[PDB]
Amino acid sequence: MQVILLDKVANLGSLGDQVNVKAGYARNFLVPQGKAVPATKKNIEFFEARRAELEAKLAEVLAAANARAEKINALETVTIASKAGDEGKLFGSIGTRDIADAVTAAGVEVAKSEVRLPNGVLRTTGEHEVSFQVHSEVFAKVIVNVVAE
Amino acid sequence: MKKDIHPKYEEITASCSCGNVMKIRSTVGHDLNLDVCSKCHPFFTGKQRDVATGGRVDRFNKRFNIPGSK
RNA sequence: UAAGGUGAUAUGAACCGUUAUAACCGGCGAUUUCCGAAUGGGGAAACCCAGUGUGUUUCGACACACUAUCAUUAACUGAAUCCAUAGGUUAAUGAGGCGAACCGGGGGAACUGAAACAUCUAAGUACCCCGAGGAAAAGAAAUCAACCGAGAUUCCCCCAG
RNA sequence: UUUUGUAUAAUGGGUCAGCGACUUAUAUUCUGUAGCAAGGUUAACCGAAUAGGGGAGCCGAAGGGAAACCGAGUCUUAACUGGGCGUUAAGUUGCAGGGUAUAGACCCGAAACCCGGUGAUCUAGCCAUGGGCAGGUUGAAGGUUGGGUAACACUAACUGGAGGACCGAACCGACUAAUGUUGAAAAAUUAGCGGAUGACUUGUGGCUGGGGGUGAAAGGCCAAUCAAACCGGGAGAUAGCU
RNA sequence: GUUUAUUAAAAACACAGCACUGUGCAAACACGAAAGUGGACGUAUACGGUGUGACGCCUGCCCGGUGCCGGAAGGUUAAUU
RNA sequence: UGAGCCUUGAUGGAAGUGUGGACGCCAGUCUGCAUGGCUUUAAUGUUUGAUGUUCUAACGUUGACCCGUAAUCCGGGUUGCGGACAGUGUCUGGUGGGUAGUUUGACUGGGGCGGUCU
RNA sequence: GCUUGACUGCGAGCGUGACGGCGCGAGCAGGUGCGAAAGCAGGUCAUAGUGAUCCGGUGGUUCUGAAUGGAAGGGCCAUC
Ligand SMILES: [Mg+2]
Ligand SMILES: [Mg+2]
Ligand SMILES: [Mg+2]
Ligand SMILES: [Mg+2]
Ligand SMILES: [Mg+2]
Ligand SMILES: [Mg+2]
Ligand SMILES: [Mg+2]
Ligand SMILES: [Mg+2]
Ligand SMILES: [Mg+2]
Ligand SMILES: [Mg+2]
Ligand SMILES: [Mg+2]
Ligand SMILES: [Mg+2]
Ligand SMILES: [Mg+2]
Ligand SMILES: [Mg+2]
Ligand SMILES: [Mg+2]
Ligand SMILES: [Mg+2]
Ligand SMILES: [Mg+2]
Ligand SMILES: [Mg+2]
Ligand SMILES: [Mg+2]
Ligand SMILES: [Mg+2]
Ligand SMILES: [Mg+2]
Ligand SMILES: [Mg+2]
Ligand SMILES: [Mg+2]
């Protein structure tokens, strides 16, 4: 009544049940060739490493990706004119590129897949707000501005 | 006769009735086989109860590290 | 150790010895046919038949010597199935059988008694099977005691018929 | 000897010689005897071994009550009476004996039960492989041919050669009578008698093991043994019987 | 044809035939603690067990009792919890 | 298909016309759904006991094939058929002259039948 | 008519039995009933109407209760 599937198979358990499981069912099938289980001290703790090393992410990984809003905020004004013209409109296309690519105007690079703006940005020149959306866990803030040339 | 992992039995006894029978009793346990070793694969030991349940809290390996060693 | 001596039922013949390698006694050896665990295979026991090596060889031969089976290890070979195992070969160790009793253990009567007989007794005796020693077995408290304490096992006398 | 009773014609003994049956161990109790005495005595063991040492312990000087308990008293009963059992009985340890207990327990003797081995060279079945059956008889099925049928059936002869077939030696078996009955013989001899190509008969070797075998069945046979073989053991079974 | 070897050879045993019953094959059944073996290198026209005993004409009534075969709804009922 | 916890219900989004299951002292109310402006007890989750379904994976295989192997044994492997059955061990109710151990009195004008045993 | 002596605890001394046991019994103690009282009553006129032991069951009691306090169990008394 104590096993650790991990490889769930229609059984009332996934990633291996740590609580009362079926018995005699595994002695000849489950365990052999199927998903070995022995929920006995030894084997137990050994599974934690296989999982606790996955949770270290919320502590460590989150950190290696949360500094986003902090690494990029004090940023110098993004001066990427989007060809402001047309008697008061623009020519440049404001969508995905200039938003993100506005960072390697010195070197650093990002991924265009992190932008946060439902509506497309009206092709203006004002304080183009750019809520950097690296990951759900962490959001950041960026800006964009157009100039005349 | 076997139940290899554990000893066995086959010891005799007298099966009394209402007061007394000076008869004899004996042969017990049972058998089974085909036990899959996590290693290569199953040699069929003829254990029995108390032998089968033993291979559980224990191993399958240490439960065999004797029928070899010794 | 020694004047004798060649075992006995019978001398006798032919001999060996008297100083110190004649006997005779004790120790260590050499030899030790065939059968018998019998072990190269077989077999109505003391017989029959072979393989592979050998020396002397008037160089066919004689006899000799090895070759059972298991277990441990070693190396080499090695199936269905890549592997790996199973299996196979070789080699070195070792066992095997006898043995009187005591000893541990596995199996275990009945007559008999109960003035019948089933519980019960006889008796865990007889017996049969396995094992080991010179003794075996047991043995340093999950013992006992009774509010005091003793201090592993074993054997002896008491406690008690 | 056994009996109420035996010369008894009821039992035992031909005779002689030798052997042949109340023992032994420990325990308990009486008797005699010795030691010591309200005390007597040690056990194992130690040992300058029959000493001496060792008094663990056993018995007696107190008993009553189911006991706690009390105590020359105590139980009984609510009873302080009476009644039961006790209270100025010397025991104890050896030794020898009478008896008892546990033992084989004066000696001899069952029919039997249980355990382990030896036996299918007899016999009963069965397996494998070999052998035997003088002679004479009867004469089925099948066929050839003639007849005959449209064709067959049917038939007549001839050939053919069957059969737990016939007669009868060998061989196998045993129905009858006599003899034998301390035999020639622990089942036969003599004269007859049944089967004799068959469920036949026989040589050699093999397989079934005792509560087991085998059995055309009688409880028959399993080595002159069978309602449970032989040998050894439990075993000196038990024997209110002789 | 067989039988009481060694007092019974028979009307007894056997027999071919008949009937009942069981057995689907790893058969029933038997030997055997088991493995295994016989049945049978057979397979229901086969194998076993029981009774009757060529053949002829036959084999009547009873299912209350016991046994066996089927049913198994309901009553009673073991270990077990 | 029973029963335990107990989860959601009936006792103890604003009117009207209707459909269904509920029971009766009966003349009735209960209760979901369109248009219209705690216990008595039921369902789902379950836990667990029952029968019955199917599956493979223990287990069987006196089916076939492959090796060990110029084996009918055995073992391994593949494959098929069977399958939580069969079968085994412990426990338990039957049945049980198949076998075993025994009992089955005495008195008595022998014994037995009869009768009697205080 | 009235009642519960078909009482409880003992018992001088006897009878009868191999024994187990069985029977008779005045008198004593505590409490009873009947009688004014002497007194009678410890089952029926007497003699048959019965079953030893063991194993237990029920009630009572500080008798005992395995370290101690209890308890189980044992004794004792009553009874099946
Ligand atoms: Mg030899
Ligand atoms: Mg040999
Ligand atoms: Mg007796
Ligand atoms: Mg007389
Ligand atoms: Mg005379
Ligand atoms: Mg004389
Ligand atoms: Mg007095
Ligand atoms: Mg003839
Ligand atoms: Mg005569
Ligand atoms: Mg003649
Ligand atoms: Mg003739
Ligand atoms: Mg012969
Ligand atoms: Mg004979
Ligand atoms: Mg004896
Ligand atoms: Mg005798
Ligand atoms: Mg005849
Ligand atoms: Mg005769
Ligand atoms: Mg005759
Ligand atoms: Mg007849
Ligand atoms: Mg009988
Ligand atoms: Mg007897
Ligand atoms: Mg009589
Ligand atoms: Mg009267």
mmCIF file of C-alpha atoms (C1' of nucleotides) in Angstrom, chain F residues 10-61:
data_model
loop_
_atom_site.group_PDB
_atom_site.id
_atom_site.type_symbol
_atom_site.label_atom_id
_atom_site.label_comp_id
_atom_site.label_asym_id
_atom_site.label_seq_id
_atom_site.Cartn_x
_atom_site.Cartn_y
_atom_site.Cartn_z
ATOM 1 C "C1'" A F 10 -37.892 18.416 1.035
ATOM 2 C "C1'" U F 11 -40.816 18.169 6.917
ATOM 3 C "C1'" G F 12 -39.257 17.726 11.928
ATOM 4 C "C1'" G F 13 -33.310 37.932 -10.435
ATOM 5 C "C1'" A F 14 -40.888 40.326 -10.092
ATOM 6 C "C1'" A F 15 -46.853 38.244 -10.585
ATOM 7 C "C1'" G F 16 -49.915 34.938 -13.923
ATOM 8 C "C1'" U F 17 -51.385 29.692 -18.212
ATOM 9 C "C1'" G F 18 -48.627 24.326 -18.101
ATOM 10 C "C1'" U F 19 -45.930 19.933 -17.835
ATOM 11 C "C1'" G F 20 -43.985 15.961 -14.690
ATOM 12 C "C1'" G F 21 -42.562 12.632 -9.595
ATOM 13 C "C1'" A F 22 -44.861 13.072 -4.214
ATOM 14 C "C1'" C F 23 -48.594 11.246 -0.690
ATOM 15 C "C1'" G F 24 -53.080 11.099 0.859
ATOM 16 C "C1'" C F 25 -58.319 11.146 6.797
ATOM 17 C "C1'" C F 26 -59.214 14.524 0.190
ATOM 18 C "C1'" A F 27 -61.006 17.243 -1.108
ATOM 19 C "C1'" G F 28 -55.103 19.003 -1.554
ATOM 20 C "C1'" U F 29 -50.775 21.030 -1.413
ATOM 21 C "C1'" C F 30 -45.139 19.937 -2.396
ATOM 22 C "C1'" U F 31 -41.792 20.583 -5.996
ATOM 23 C "C1'" G F 32 -37.445 21.589 -11.205
ATOM 24 C "C1'" C F 33 -38.196 23.588 -15.797
ATOM 25 C "C1'" A F 34 -40.840 28.086 -20.963
ATOM 26 C "C1'" U F 35 -43.258 32.487 -22.168
ATOM 27 C "C1'" G F 36 -44.515 36.465 -19.953
ATOM 28 C "C1'" G F 37 -42.083 42.707 -19.501
ATOM 29 C "C1'" C F 38 -28.697 16.422 12.848
ATOM 30 C "C1'" U F 39 -32.079 12.854 12.002
ATOM 31 C "C1'" U F 40 -36.695 9.971 8.190
ATOM 32 C "C1'" U F 41 -35.437 10.058 3.401
ATOM 33 C "C1'" A F 42 -33.571 10.709 -2.242
ATOM 34 C "C1'" A F 43 -29.066 11.983 -6.231
ATOM 35 C "C1'" U F 44 -23.282 12.788 -7.094
ATOM 36 C "C1'" G F 45 -18.471 11.979 -4.690
ATOM 37 C "C1'" U F 46 -16.920 8.341 -2.565
ATOM 38 C "C1'" U F 47 -15.163 3.507 1.190
ATOM 39 C "C1'" U F 48 -16.514 -1.238 1.355
ATOM 40 C "C1'" G F 49 -19.332 -6.089 0.929
ATOM 41 C "C1'" A F 50 -21.936 -8.755 -3.048
ATOM 42 C "C1'" U F 51 -23.099 -11.193 -7.979
ATOM 43 C "C1'" G F 52 -21.854 -10.629 -12.841
ATOM 44 C "C1'" U F 53 -18.608 -8.570 -17.288
ATOM 45 C "C1'" U F 54 -13.804 -8.172 -19.713
ATOM 46 C "C1'" C F 55 -8.397 -7.676 -19.612
ATOM 47 C "C1'" U F 56 -2.973 -9.540 -18.583
ATOM 48 C "C1'" A F 57 0.490 -9.716 -15.337
ATOM 49 C "C1'" A F 58 1.024 -13.561 -11.203
ATOM 50 C "C1'" C F 59 -0.559 -19.107 -11.988
ATOM 51 C "C1'" G F 60 -1.571 -23.604 -15.452
ATOM 52 C "C1'" U F 61 -0.637 -25.743 -19.970
#
